[PDB]
Amino acid sequence: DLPMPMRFRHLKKTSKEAVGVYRSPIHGRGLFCKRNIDAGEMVIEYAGIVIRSILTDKREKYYDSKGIGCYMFRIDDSEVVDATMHGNAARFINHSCEPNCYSRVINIDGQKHIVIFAMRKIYRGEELTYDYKFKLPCNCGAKKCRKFL
Ligand SMILES: Nc1ncnc2c1ncn2[C@@H]1O[C@H](CN(CC[C@H](N)C(=O)O)CC2CN(Cc3cccc(Cl)c3)C2)[C@@H](O)[C@H]1O
Ligand SMILES: [Zn+2]
């Protein structure tokens, strides 16, 4: 509808009104919508620090040794977004084999941002989920479940 940079500019204030973090029956805590989200709507940024992929093993190791949950989003084989210290509510988005959301790497004014889009209209109360990029069982509960993450 509106160009990608024109759609990114409006998020921080609107995401606070559109989504919340609560207990999820899929796993631990999840992201849920507080009001209906239109199909194609830019929901929230997966906020954090873009770091080199080779650095993730040691960073995860450091966080695990401190008893701090490690929240990372895989961009590609070379970069990852570390949402552990400088993240937002998007770090709680669970995986699903019938997602209602999808992740995209956008580039606004030279800077890379991971944004979450709604692929269908999402209704008040629904949990927001995306198909994770990647031995680990899946609890999304969908009919067409891949049964592993
Ligand atoms: N469909 C699915 N079927 C089963 N498992 C699923 C799932 N989709 C998501 N997951 C699990 O979640 C992880 C992704 N996380 C998303 C938010 C998560 N729900 C959360 O409460 O923090 C962020 C991770 C960082 N970690 C901190 C943590 C570590 C141990 C226990 C707990 Cl409570 C929390 C969690 C995946 O790696 C899976 O392990
Ligand atoms: Zn599934």
Side-chain angles (χ1 to χ4, degrees), residues 24 26-30 69-72 91-96 132 134 137-140:
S24 166
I26 290 162
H27 175 283
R29 284 172 298 170
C70 180
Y71 290 87
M72 290 180 175
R91 73 191 191 272
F92 298 98
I93 302 164
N94 284 320
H95 168 75
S96 174
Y132 279 18
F134 64 103
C138 166
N139 202 50
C140 77

mmCIF file with all atom_site columns, all heavy atoms in Angstrom, residues 24 26-30 69-72 91-96 132 134 137-140 149, ligand 1, unseen atoms left out:
data_model
loop_
_atom_site.group_PDB
_atom_site.id
_atom_site.type_symbol
_atom_site.label_atom_id
_atom_site.label_alt_id
_atom_site.label_comp_id
_atom_site.label_asym_id
_atom_site.label_entity_id
_atom_site.label_seq_id
_atom_site.pdbx_PDB_ins_code
_atom_site.Cartn_x
_atom_site.Cartn_y
_atom_site.Cartn_z
_atom_site.occupancy
_atom_site.B_iso_or_equiv
_atom_site.pdbx_formal_charge
_atom_site.auth_seq_id
_atom_site.auth_comp_id
_atom_site.auth_asym_id
_atom_site.auth_atom_id
_atom_site.pdbx_PDB_model_num
ATOM   1   N  N   . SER A 1 24  ? 1.785  -18.017 26.930 1.00 0.00 ? 24  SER A N   1
ATOM   2   C  CA  . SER A 1 24  ? 1.372  -18.698 25.707 1.00 0.00 ? 24  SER A CA  1
ATOM   3   C  C   . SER A 1 24  ? 1.216  -20.192 25.921 1.00 0.00 ? 24  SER A C   1
ATOM   4   O  O   . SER A 1 24  ? 2.104  -20.795 26.538 1.00 0.00 ? 24  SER A O   1
ATOM   5   C  CB  . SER A 1 24  ? 2.388  -18.472 24.601 1.00 0.00 ? 24  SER A CB  1
ATOM   6   O  OG  . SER A 1 24  ? 2.151  -19.390 23.547 1.00 0.00 ? 24  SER A OG  1
ATOM   7   N  N   . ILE A 1 26  ? 1.628  -22.247 23.583 1.00 0.00 ? 26  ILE A N   1
ATOM   8   C  CA  . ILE A 1 26  ? 2.612  -22.798 22.653 1.00 0.00 ? 26  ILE A CA  1
ATOM   9   C  C   . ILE A 1 26  ? 3.899  -23.020 23.455 1.00 0.00 ? 26  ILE A C   1
ATOM   10  O  O   . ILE A 1 26  ? 4.350  -24.152 23.545 1.00 0.00 ? 26  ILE A O   1
ATOM   11  C  CB  . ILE A 1 26  ? 2.810  -21.929 21.368 1.00 0.00 ? 26  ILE A CB  1
ATOM   12  C  CG1 . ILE A 1 26  ? 1.573  -21.995 20.457 1.00 0.00 ? 26  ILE A CG1 1
ATOM   13  C  CG2 . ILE A 1 26  ? 4.058  -22.355 20.601 1.00 0.00 ? 26  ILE A CG2 1
ATOM   14  C  CD1 . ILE A 1 26  ? 1.476  -20.827 19.385 1.00 0.00 ? 26  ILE A CD1 1
ATOM   15  N  N   . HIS A 1 27  ? 4.430  -21.960 24.091 1.00 0.00 ? 27  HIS A N   1
ATOM   16  C  CA  . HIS A 1 27  ? 5.639  -22.003 24.926 1.00 0.00 ? 27  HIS A CA  1
ATOM   17  C  C   . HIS A 1 27  ? 5.796  -20.692 25.693 1.00 0.00 ? 27  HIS A C   1
ATOM   18  O  O   . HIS A 1 27  ? 5.672  -19.616 25.096 1.00 0.00 ? 27  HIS A O   1
ATOM   19  C  CB  . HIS A 1 27  ? 6.896  -22.223 24.054 1.00 0.00 ? 27  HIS A CB  1
ATOM   20  C  CG  . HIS A 1 27  ? 8.198  -22.169 24.803 1.00 0.00 ? 27  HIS A CG  1
ATOM   21  N  ND1 . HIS A 1 27  ? 8.766  -20.956 25.200 1.00 0.00 ? 27  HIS A ND1 1
ATOM   22  C  CD2 . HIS A 1 27  ? 9.034  -23.176 25.148 1.00 0.00 ? 27  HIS A CD2 1
ATOM   23  C  CE1 . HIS A 1 27  ? 9.902  -21.270 25.800 1.00 0.00 ? 27  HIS A CE1 1
ATOM   24  N  NE2 . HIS A 1 27  ? 10.131 -22.587 25.761 1.00 0.00 ? 27  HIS A NE2 1
ATOM   25  N  N   . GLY A 1 28  ? 6.180  -20.815 26.970 1.00 0.00 ? 28  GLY A N   1
ATOM   26  C  CA  . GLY A 1 28  ? 6.517  -19.721 27.884 1.00 0.00 ? 28  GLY A CA  1
ATOM   27  C  C   . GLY A 1 28  ? 5.632  -18.511 27.749 1.00 0.00 ? 28  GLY A C   1
ATOM   28  O  O   . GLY A 1 28  ? 4.440  -18.581 28.045 1.00 0.00 ? 28  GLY A O   1
ATOM   29  N  N   . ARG A 1 29  ? 6.204  -17.395 27.273 1.00 0.00 ? 29  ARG A N   1
ATOM   30  C  CA  . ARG A 1 29  ? 5.409  -16.196 27.024 1.00 0.00 ? 29  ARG A CA  1
ATOM   31  C  C   . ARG A 1 29  ? 5.358  -15.967 25.530 1.00 0.00 ? 29  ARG A C   1
ATOM   32  O  O   . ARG A 1 29  ? 6.268  -16.364 24.813 1.00 0.00 ? 29  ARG A O   1
ATOM   33  C  CB  . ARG A 1 29  ? 5.970  -14.961 27.769 1.00 0.00 ? 29  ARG A CB  1
ATOM   34  C  CG  . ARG A 1 29  ? 5.655  -14.951 29.274 1.00 0.00 ? 29  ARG A CG  1
ATOM   35  C  CD  . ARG A 1 29  ? 6.374  -13.825 30.000 1.00 0.00 ? 29  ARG A CD  1
ATOM   36  N  NE  . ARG A 1 29  ? 7.832  -13.975 29.894 1.00 0.00 ? 29  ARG A NE  1
ATOM   37  C  CZ  . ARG A 1 29  ? 8.721  -13.058 30.268 1.00 0.00 ? 29  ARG A CZ  1
ATOM   38  N  NH1 . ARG A 1 29  ? 8.317  -11.883 30.739 1.00 0.00 ? 29  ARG A NH1 1
ATOM   39  N  NH2 . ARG A 1 29  ? 10.022 -13.304 30.161 1.00 0.00 ? 29  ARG A NH2 1
ATOM   40  N  N   . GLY A 1 30  ? 4.278  -15.374 25.063 1.00 0.00 ? 30  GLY A N   1
ATOM   41  C  CA  . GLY A 1 30  ? 4.120  -15.059 23.651 1.00 0.00 ? 30  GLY A CA  1
ATOM   42  C  C   . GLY A 1 30  ? 3.623  -13.639 23.441 1.00 0.00 ? 30  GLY A C   1
ATOM   43  O  O   . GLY A 1 30  ? 3.245  -12.955 24.409 1.00 0.00 ? 30  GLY A O   1
ATOM   44  N  N   . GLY A 1 69  ? 18.107 -15.071 29.777 1.00 0.00 ? 69  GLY A N   1
ATOM   45  C  CA  . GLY A 1 69  ? 17.534 -15.634 28.561 1.00 0.00 ? 69  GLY A CA  1
ATOM   46  C  C   . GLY A 1 69  ? 18.161 -14.963 27.353 1.00 0.00 ? 69  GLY A C   1
ATOM   47  O  O   . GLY A 1 69  ? 18.362 -13.749 27.352 1.00 0.00 ? 69  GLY A O   1
ATOM   48  N  N   . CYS A 1 70  ? 18.559 -15.757 26.366 1.00 0.00 ? 70  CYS A N   1
ATOM   49  C  CA  . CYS A 1 70  ? 19.207 -15.286 25.143 1.00 0.00 ? 70  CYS A CA  1
ATOM   50  C  C   . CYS A 1 70  ? 18.143 -15.165 24.067 1.00 0.00 ? 70  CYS A C   1
ATOM   51  O  O   . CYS A 1 70  ? 17.520 -16.155 23.758 1.00 0.00 ? 70  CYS A O   1
ATOM   52  C  CB  . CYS A 1 70  ? 20.305 -16.261 24.721 1.00 0.00 ? 70  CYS A CB  1
ATOM   53  S  SG  . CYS A 1 70  ? 21.172 -15.752 23.215 1.00 0.00 ? 70  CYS A SG  1
ATOM   54  N  N   . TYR A 1 71  ? 17.929 -13.978 23.507 1.00 0.00 ? 71  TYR A N   1
ATOM   55  C  CA  . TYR A 1 71  ? 16.893 -13.719 22.486 1.00 0.00 ? 71  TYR A CA  1
ATOM   56  C  C   . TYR A 1 71  ? 17.609 -13.246 21.225 1.00 0.00 ? 71  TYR A C   1
ATOM   57  O  O   . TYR A 1 71  ? 18.120 -12.136 21.186 1.00 0.00 ? 71  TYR A O   1
ATOM   58  C  CB  . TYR A 1 71  ? 15.902 -12.630 22.991 1.00 0.00 ? 71  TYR A CB  1
ATOM   59  C  CG  . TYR A 1 71  ? 15.002 -13.111 24.115 1.00 0.00 ? 71  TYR A CG  1
ATOM   60  C  CD1 . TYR A 1 71  ? 15.411 -13.040 25.447 1.00 0.00 ? 71  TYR A CD1 1
ATOM   61  C  CD2 . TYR A 1 71  ? 13.752 -13.648 23.846 1.00 0.00 ? 71  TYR A CD2 1
ATOM   62  C  CE1 . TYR A 1 71  ? 14.602 -13.544 26.478 1.00 0.00 ? 71  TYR A CE1 1
ATOM   63  C  CE2 . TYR A 1 71  ? 12.931 -14.126 24.862 1.00 0.00 ? 71  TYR A CE2 1
ATOM   64  C  CZ  . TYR A 1 71  ? 13.363 -14.092 26.172 1.00 0.00 ? 71  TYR A CZ  1
ATOM   65  O  OH  . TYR A 1 71  ? 12.521 -14.615 27.122 1.00 0.00 ? 71  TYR A OH  1
ATOM   66  N  N   . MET A 1 72  ? 17.664 -14.101 20.209 1.00 0.00 ? 72  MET A N   1
ATOM   67  C  CA  . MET A 1 72  ? 18.329 -13.806 18.947 1.00 0.00 ? 72  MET A CA  1
ATOM   68  C  C   . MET A 1 72  ? 17.471 -14.201 17.780 1.00 0.00 ? 72  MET A C   1
ATOM   69  O  O   . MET A 1 72  ? 16.753 -15.201 17.851 1.00 0.00 ? 72  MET A O   1
ATOM   70  C  CB  . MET A 1 72  ? 19.695 -14.501 18.871 1.00 0.00 ? 72  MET A CB  1
ATOM   71  C  CG  . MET A 1 72  ? 20.720 -13.903 19.828 1.00 0.00 ? 72  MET A CG  1
ATOM   72  S  SD  . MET A 1 72  ? 22.349 -14.698 19.780 1.00 0.00 ? 72  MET A SD  1
ATOM   73  C  CE  . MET A 1 72  ? 23.230 -13.644 20.877 1.00 0.00 ? 72  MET A CE  1
ATOM   74  N  N   . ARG A 1 91  ? 10.580 -9.959  20.745 1.00 0.00 ? 91  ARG A N   1
ATOM   75  C  CA  . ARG A 1 91  ? 11.466 -11.080 21.064 1.00 0.00 ? 91  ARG A CA  1
ATOM   76  C  C   . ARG A 1 91  ? 10.693 -12.299 21.632 1.00 0.00 ? 91  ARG A C   1
ATOM   77  O  O   . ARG A 1 91  ? 11.243 -13.396 21.681 1.00 0.00 ? 91  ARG A O   1
ATOM   78  C  CB  . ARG A 1 91  ? 12.646 -10.655 21.974 1.00 0.00 ? 91  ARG A CB  1
ATOM   79  C  CG  . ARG A 1 91  ? 12.283 -10.375 23.406 1.00 0.00 ? 91  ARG A CG  1
ATOM   80  C  CD  . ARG A 1 91  ? 13.462 -9.697  24.125 1.00 0.00 ? 91  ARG A CD  1
ATOM   81  N  NE  . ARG A 1 91  ? 13.240 -9.634  25.573 1.00 0.00 ? 91  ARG A NE  1
ATOM   82  C  CZ  . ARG A 1 91  ? 12.614 -8.650  26.211 1.00 0.00 ? 91  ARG A CZ  1
ATOM   83  N  NH1 . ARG A 1 91  ? 12.120 -7.619  25.538 1.00 0.00 ? 91  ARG A NH1 1
ATOM   84  N  NH2 . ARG A 1 91  ? 12.470 -8.692  27.524 1.00 0.00 ? 91  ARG A NH2 1
ATOM   85  N  N   . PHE A 1 92  ? 9.421  -12.101 22.056 1.00 0.00 ? 92  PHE A N   1
ATOM   86  C  CA  . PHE A 1 92  ? 8.589  -13.188 22.568 1.00 0.00 ? 92  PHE A CA  1
ATOM   87  C  C   . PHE A 1 92  ? 7.723  -13.890 21.511 1.00 0.00 ? 92  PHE A C   1
ATOM   88  O  O   . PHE A 1 92  ? 6.989  -14.804 21.878 1.00 0.00 ? 92  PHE A O   1
ATOM   89  C  CB  . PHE A 1 92  ? 7.725  -12.700 23.723 1.00 0.00 ? 92  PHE A CB  1
ATOM   90  C  CG  . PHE A 1 92  ? 8.514  -12.220 24.913 1.00 0.00 ? 92  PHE A CG  1
ATOM   91  C  CD1 . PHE A 1 92  ? 8.758  -10.866 25.102 1.00 0.00 ? 92  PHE A CD1 1
ATOM   92  C  CD2 . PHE A 1 92  ? 9.044  -13.126 25.828 1.00 0.00 ? 92  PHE A CD2 1
ATOM   93  C  CE1 . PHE A 1 92  ? 9.483  -10.420 26.213 1.00 0.00 ? 92  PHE A CE1 1
ATOM   94  C  CE2 . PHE A 1 92  ? 9.776  -12.681 26.932 1.00 0.00 ? 92  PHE A CE2 1
ATOM   95  C  CZ  . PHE A 1 92  ? 9.972  -11.331 27.128 1.00 0.00 ? 92  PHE A CZ  1
ATOM   96  N  N   . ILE A 1 93  ? 7.799  -13.496 20.220 1.00 0.00 ? 93  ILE A N   1
ATOM   97  C  CA  . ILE A 1 93  ? 6.985  -14.118 19.163 1.00 0.00 ? 93  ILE A CA  1
ATOM   98  C  C   . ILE A 1 93  ? 7.365  -15.579 18.984 1.00 0.00 ? 93  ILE A C   1
ATOM   99  O  O   . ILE A 1 93  ? 8.503  -15.872 18.609 1.00 0.00 ? 93  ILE A O   1
ATOM   100 C  CB  . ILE A 1 93  ? 7.043  -13.348 17.794 1.00 0.00 ? 93  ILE A CB  1
ATOM   101 C  CG1 . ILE A 1 93  ? 6.590  -11.891 17.945 1.00 0.00 ? 93  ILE A CG1 1
ATOM   102 C  CG2 . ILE A 1 93  ? 6.195  -14.081 16.702 1.00 0.00 ? 93  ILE A CG2 1
ATOM   103 C  CD1 . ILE A 1 93  ? 6.965  -11.036 16.799 1.00 0.00 ? 93  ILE A CD1 1
ATOM   104 N  N   . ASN A 1 94  ? 6.420  -16.490 19.231 1.00 0.00 ? 94  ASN A N   1
ATOM   105 C  CA  . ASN A 1 94  ? 6.643  -17.934 19.058 1.00 0.00 ? 94  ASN A CA  1
ATOM   106 C  C   . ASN A 1 94  ? 6.543  -18.383 17.614 1.00 0.00 ? 94  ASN A C   1
ATOM   107 O  O   . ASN A 1 94  ? 6.044  -17.648 16.774 1.00 0.00 ? 94  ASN A O   1
ATOM   108 C  CB  . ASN A 1 94  ? 5.657  -18.756 19.922 1.00 0.00 ? 94  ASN A CB  1
ATOM   109 C  CG  . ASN A 1 94  ? 6.040  -18.767 21.377 1.00 0.00 ? 94  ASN A CG  1
ATOM   110 O  OD1 . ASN A 1 94  ? 7.218  -18.875 21.746 1.00 0.00 ? 94  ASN A OD1 1
ATOM   111 N  ND2 . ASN A 1 94  ? 5.063  -18.631 22.234 1.00 0.00 ? 94  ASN A ND2 1
ATOM   112 N  N   . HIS A 1 95  ? 7.021  -19.597 17.333 1.00 0.00 ? 95  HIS A N   1
ATOM   113 C  CA  . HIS A 1 95  ? 6.966  -20.259 16.025 1.00 0.00 ? 95  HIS A CA  1
ATOM   114 C  C   . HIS A 1 95  ? 5.601  -20.930 15.796 1.00 0.00 ? 95  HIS A C   1
ATOM   115 O  O   . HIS A 1 95  ? 4.968  -21.382 16.753 1.00 0.00 ? 95  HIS A O   1
ATOM   116 C  CB  . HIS A 1 95  ? 8.076  -21.328 15.935 1.00 0.00 ? 95  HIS A CB  1
ATOM   117 C  CG  . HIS A 1 95  ? 7.932  -22.245 14.769 1.00 0.00 ? 95  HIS A CG  1
ATOM   118 N  ND1 . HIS A 1 95  ? 8.235  -21.831 13.484 1.00 0.00 ? 95  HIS A ND1 1
ATOM   119 C  CD2 . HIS A 1 95  ? 7.462  -23.510 14.722 1.00 0.00 ? 95  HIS A CD2 1
ATOM   120 C  CE1 . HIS A 1 95  ? 7.950  -22.857 12.704 1.00 0.00 ? 95  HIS A CE1 1
ATOM   121 N  NE2 . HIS A 1 95  ? 7.468  -23.883 13.404 1.00 0.00 ? 95  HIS A NE2 1
ATOM   122 N  N   . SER A 1 96  ? 5.173  -21.032 14.516 1.00 0.00 ? 96  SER A N   1
ATOM   123 C  CA  . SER A 1 96  ? 3.965  -21.760 14.093 1.00 0.00 ? 96  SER A CA  1
ATOM   124 C  C   . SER A 1 96  ? 4.084  -22.200 12.657 1.00 0.00 ? 96  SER A C   1
ATOM   125 O  O   . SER A 1 96  ? 4.642  -21.472 11.843 1.00 0.00 ? 96  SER A O   1
ATOM   126 C  CB  . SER A 1 96  ? 2.692  -20.944 14.294 1.00 0.00 ? 96  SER A CB  1
ATOM   127 O  OG  . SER A 1 96  ? 1.546  -21.596 13.770 1.00 0.00 ? 96  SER A OG  1
ATOM   128 N  N   . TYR A 1 132 ? 9.654  -19.926 11.906 1.00 0.00 ? 132 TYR A N   1
ATOM   129 C  CA  . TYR A 1 132 ? 11.080 -19.724 12.208 1.00 0.00 ? 132 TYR A CA  1
ATOM   130 C  C   . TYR A 1 132 ? 11.898 -20.260 11.050 1.00 0.00 ? 132 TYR A C   1
ATOM   131 O  O   . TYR A 1 132 ? 11.498 -21.263 10.440 1.00 0.00 ? 132 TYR A O   1
ATOM   132 C  CB  . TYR A 1 132 ? 11.488 -20.477 13.486 1.00 0.00 ? 132 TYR A CB  1
ATOM   133 C  CG  . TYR A 1 132 ? 11.150 -19.790 14.798 1.00 0.00 ? 132 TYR A CG  1
ATOM   134 C  CD1 . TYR A 1 132 ? 10.211 -18.763 14.854 1.00 0.00 ? 132 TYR A CD1 1
ATOM   135 C  CD2 . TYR A 1 132 ? 11.728 -20.208 15.993 1.00 0.00 ? 132 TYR A CD2 1
ATOM   136 C  CE1 . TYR A 1 132 ? 9.867  -18.159 16.064 1.00 0.00 ? 132 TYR A CE1 1
ATOM   137 C  CE2 . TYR A 1 132 ? 11.382 -19.622 17.209 1.00 0.00 ? 132 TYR A CE2 1
ATOM   138 C  CZ  . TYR A 1 132 ? 10.446 -18.604 17.238 1.00 0.00 ? 132 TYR A CZ  1
ATOM   139 O  OH  . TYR A 1 132 ? 10.131 -18.000 18.419 1.00 0.00 ? 132 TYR A OH  1
ATOM   140 N  N   . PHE A 1 134 ? 14.624 -22.015 10.864 1.00 0.00 ? 134 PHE A N   1
ATOM   141 C  CA  . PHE A 1 134 ? 15.017 -23.407 11.087 1.00 0.00 ? 134 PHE A CA  1
ATOM   142 C  C   . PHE A 1 134 ? 13.798 -24.297 11.338 1.00 0.00 ? 134 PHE A C   1
ATOM   143 O  O   . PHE A 1 134 ? 13.817 -25.480 11.003 1.00 0.00 ? 134 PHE A O   1
ATOM   144 C  CB  . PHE A 1 134 ? 16.028 -23.510 12.250 1.00 0.00 ? 134 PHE A CB  1
ATOM   145 C  CG  . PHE A 1 134 ? 15.521 -23.089 13.613 1.00 0.00 ? 134 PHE A CG  1
ATOM   146 C  CD1 . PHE A 1 134 ? 15.167 -24.038 14.564 1.00 0.00 ? 134 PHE A CD1 1
ATOM   147 C  CD2 . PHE A 1 134 ? 15.448 -21.745 13.964 1.00 0.00 ? 134 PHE A CD2 1
ATOM   148 C  CE1 . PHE A 1 134 ? 14.717 -23.651 15.830 1.00 0.00 ? 134 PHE A CE1 1
ATOM   149 C  CE2 . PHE A 1 134 ? 14.990 -21.358 15.228 1.00 0.00 ? 134 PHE A CE2 1
ATOM   150 C  CZ  . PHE A 1 134 ? 14.631 -22.313 16.153 1.00 0.00 ? 134 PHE A CZ  1
ATOM   151 N  N   . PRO A 1 137 ? 10.958 -30.263 19.139 1.00 0.00 ? 137 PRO A N   1
ATOM   152 C  CA  . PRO A 1 137 ? 9.513  -30.430 18.858 1.00 0.00 ? 137 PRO A CA  1
ATOM   153 C  C   . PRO A 1 137 ? 8.707  -29.136 18.818 1.00 0.00 ? 137 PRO A C   1
ATOM   154 O  O   . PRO A 1 137 ? 9.031  -28.193 19.531 1.00 0.00 ? 137 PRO A O   1
ATOM   155 C  CB  . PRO A 1 137 ? 9.031  -31.381 19.958 1.00 0.00 ? 137 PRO A CB  1
ATOM   156 C  CG  . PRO A 1 137 ? 10.005 -31.209 21.064 1.00 0.00 ? 137 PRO A CG  1
ATOM   157 C  CD  . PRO A 1 137 ? 11.325 -30.839 20.450 1.00 0.00 ? 137 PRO A CD  1
ATOM   158 N  N   . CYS A 1 138 ? 7.653  -29.101 17.977 1.00 0.00 ? 138 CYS A N   1
ATOM   159 C  CA  . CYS A 1 138 ? 6.786  -27.939 17.796 1.00 0.00 ? 138 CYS A CA  1
ATOM   160 C  C   . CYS A 1 138 ? 5.404  -28.122 18.425 1.00 0.00 ? 138 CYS A C   1
ATOM   161 O  O   . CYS A 1 138 ? 4.751  -29.155 18.223 1.00 0.00 ? 138 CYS A O   1
ATOM   162 C  CB  . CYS A 1 138 ? 6.693  -27.569 16.322 1.00 0.00 ? 138 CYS A CB  1
ATOM   163 S  SG  . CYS A 1 138 ? 5.358  -26.420 15.929 1.00 0.00 ? 138 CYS A SG  1
ATOM   164 N  N   . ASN A 1 139 ? 4.946  -27.079 19.143 1.00 0.00 ? 139 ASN A N   1
ATOM   165 C  CA  . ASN A 1 139 ? 3.677  -27.042 19.867 1.00 0.00 ? 139 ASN A CA  1
ATOM   166 C  C   . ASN A 1 139 ? 2.664  -26.018 19.309 1.00 0.00 ? 139 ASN A C   1
ATOM   167 O  O   . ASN A 1 139 ? 1.714  -25.648 20.011 1.00 0.00 ? 139 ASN A O   1
ATOM   168 C  CB  . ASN A 1 139 ? 3.947  -26.812 21.370 1.00 0.00 ? 139 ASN A CB  1
ATOM   169 C  CG  . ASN A 1 139 ? 2.831  -27.251 22.293 1.00 0.00 ? 139 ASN A CG  1
ATOM   170 O  OD1 . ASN A 1 139 ? 2.312  -28.372 22.212 1.00 0.00 ? 139 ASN A OD1 1
ATOM   171 N  ND2 . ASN A 1 139 ? 2.436  -26.378 23.198 1.00 0.00 ? 139 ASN A ND2 1
ATOM   172 N  N   . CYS A 1 140 ? 2.821  -25.590 18.036 1.00 0.00 ? 140 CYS A N   1
ATOM   173 C  CA  . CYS A 1 140 ? 1.891  -24.601 17.458 1.00 0.00 ? 140 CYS A CA  1
ATOM   174 C  C   . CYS A 1 140 ? 0.433  -25.075 17.479 1.00 0.00 ? 140 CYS A C   1
ATOM   175 O  O   . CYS A 1 140 ? -0.466 -24.246 17.608 1.00 0.00 ? 140 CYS A O   1
ATOM   176 C  CB  . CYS A 1 140 ? 2.322  -24.178 16.058 1.00 0.00 ? 140 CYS A CB  1
ATOM   177 S  SG  . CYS A 1 140 ? 1.949  -25.387 14.767 1.00 0.00 ? 140 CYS A SG  1
ATOM   178 N  N   . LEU A 1 149 ? 10.597 -27.656 14.949 1.00 0.00 ? 149 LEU A N   1
ATOM   179 C  CA  . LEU A 1 149 ? 10.998 -26.275 14.665 1.00 0.00 ? 149 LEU A CA  1
ATOM   180 C  C   . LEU A 1 149 ? 12.209 -26.240 13.736 1.00 0.00 ? 149 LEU A C   1
ATOM   181 O  O   . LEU A 1 149 ? 12.855 -27.264 13.524 1.00 0.00 ? 149 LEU A O   1
ATOM   182 C  CB  . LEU A 1 149 ? 11.292 -25.507 15.963 1.00 0.00 ? 149 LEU A CB  1
HETATM 183 N  N1  . LIG B 2 .   ? 6.041  -23.633 18.145 1.00 0.00 ? 1   LIG B N1  1
HETATM 184 C  C1  . LIG B 2 .   ? 6.893  -23.858 19.179 1.00 0.00 ? 1   LIG B C1  1
HETATM 185 N  N2  . LIG B 2 .   ? 6.909  -25.088 19.771 1.00 0.00 ? 1   LIG B N2  1
HETATM 186 C  C2  . LIG B 2 .   ? 7.768  -25.275 20.832 1.00 0.00 ? 1   LIG B C2  1
HETATM 187 N  N3  . LIG B 2 .   ? 8.639  -24.387 21.389 1.00 0.00 ? 1   LIG B N3  1
HETATM 188 C  C3  . LIG B 2 .   ? 8.590  -23.146 20.751 1.00 0.00 ? 1   LIG B C3  1
HETATM 189 C  C4  . LIG B 2 .   ? 7.734  -22.821 19.664 1.00 0.00 ? 1   LIG B C4  1
HETATM 190 N  N4  . LIG B 2 .   ? 7.885  -21.470 19.276 1.00 0.00 ? 1   LIG B N4  1
HETATM 191 C  C5  . LIG B 2 .   ? 8.824  -20.987 20.097 1.00 0.00 ? 1   LIG B C5  1
HETATM 192 N  N5  . LIG B 2 .   ? 9.311  -21.975 21.009 1.00 0.00 ? 1   LIG B N5  1
HETATM 193 C  C6  . LIG B 2 .   ? 10.435 -21.904 21.940 1.00 0.00 ? 1   LIG B C6  1
HETATM 194 O  O1  . LIG B 2 .   ? 10.710 -20.564 22.171 1.00 0.00 ? 1   LIG B O1  1
HETATM 195 C  C7  . LIG B 2 .   ? 12.021 -20.251 21.704 1.00 0.00 ? 1   LIG B C7  1
HETATM 196 C  C8  . LIG B 2 .   ? 11.981 -18.837 21.077 1.00 0.00 ? 1   LIG B C8  1
HETATM 197 N  N6  . LIG B 2 .   ? 11.627 -17.851 22.171 1.00 0.00 ? 1   LIG B N6  1
HETATM 198 C  C9  . LIG B 2 .   ? 10.307 -17.128 21.929 1.00 0.00 ? 1   LIG B C9  1
HETATM 199 C  C10 . LIG B 2 .   ? 9.727  -16.579 23.263 1.00 0.00 ? 1   LIG B C10 1
HETATM 200 C  C11 . LIG B 2 .   ? 9.555  -17.701 24.322 1.00 0.00 ? 1   LIG B C11 1
HETATM 201 N  N7  . LIG B 2 .   ? 8.179  -18.242 24.224 1.00 0.00 ? 1   LIG B N7  1
HETATM 202 C  C12 . LIG B 2 .   ? 9.863  -17.079 25.695 1.00 0.00 ? 1   LIG B C12 1
HETATM 203 O  O2  . LIG B 2 .   ? 8.915  -17.274 26.608 1.00 0.00 ? 1   LIG B O2  1
HETATM 204 O  O3  . LIG B 2 .   ? 10.860 -16.461 26.010 1.00 0.00 ? 1   LIG B O3  1
HETATM 205 C  C13 . LIG B 2 .   ? 12.775 -17.010 22.593 1.00 0.00 ? 1   LIG B C13 1
HETATM 206 C  C14 . LIG B 2 .   ? 13.774 -17.946 23.321 1.00 0.00 ? 1   LIG B C14 1
HETATM 207 C  C15 . LIG B 2 .   ? 14.862 -17.287 24.202 1.00 0.00 ? 1   LIG B C15 1
HETATM 208 N  N8  . LIG B 2 .   ? 14.485 -18.238 25.328 1.00 0.00 ? 1   LIG B N8  1
HETATM 209 C  C16 . LIG B 2 .   ? 14.347 -17.741 26.719 1.00 0.00 ? 1   LIG B C16 1
HETATM 210 C  C17 . LIG B 2 .   ? 13.755 -18.909 27.479 1.00 0.00 ? 1   LIG B C17 1
HETATM 211 C  C18 . LIG B 2 .   ? 14.511 -20.106 27.619 1.00 0.00 ? 1   LIG B C18 1
HETATM 212 C  C19 . LIG B 2 .   ? 13.932 -21.240 28.276 1.00 0.00 ? 1   LIG B C19 1
HETATM 213 C  C20 . LIG B 2 .   ? 12.608 -21.182 28.777 1.00 0.00 ? 1   LIG B C20 1
HETATM 214 C  C21 . LIG B 2 .   ? 11.910 -19.990 28.624 1.00 0.00 ? 1   LIG B C21 1
HETATM 215 CL CL1 . LIG B 2 .   ? 10.318 -19.888 29.275 1.00 0.00 ? 1   LIG B CL1 1
HETATM 216 C  C22 . LIG B 2 .   ? 12.445 -18.840 27.988 1.00 0.00 ? 1   LIG B C22 1
HETATM 217 C  C23 . LIG B 2 .   ? 13.217 -18.585 24.639 1.00 0.00 ? 1   LIG B C23 1
HETATM 218 C  C24 . LIG B 2 .   ? 12.395 -21.343 20.658 1.00 0.00 ? 1   LIG B C24 1
HETATM 219 O  O4  . LIG B 2 .   ? 13.773 -21.511 20.512 1.00 0.00 ? 1   LIG B O4  1
HETATM 220 C  C25 . LIG B 2 .   ? 11.723 -22.543 21.297 1.00 0.00 ? 1   LIG B C25 1
HETATM 221 O  O5  . LIG B 2 .   ? 12.489 -22.951 22.368 1.00 0.00 ? 1   LIG B O5  1
#
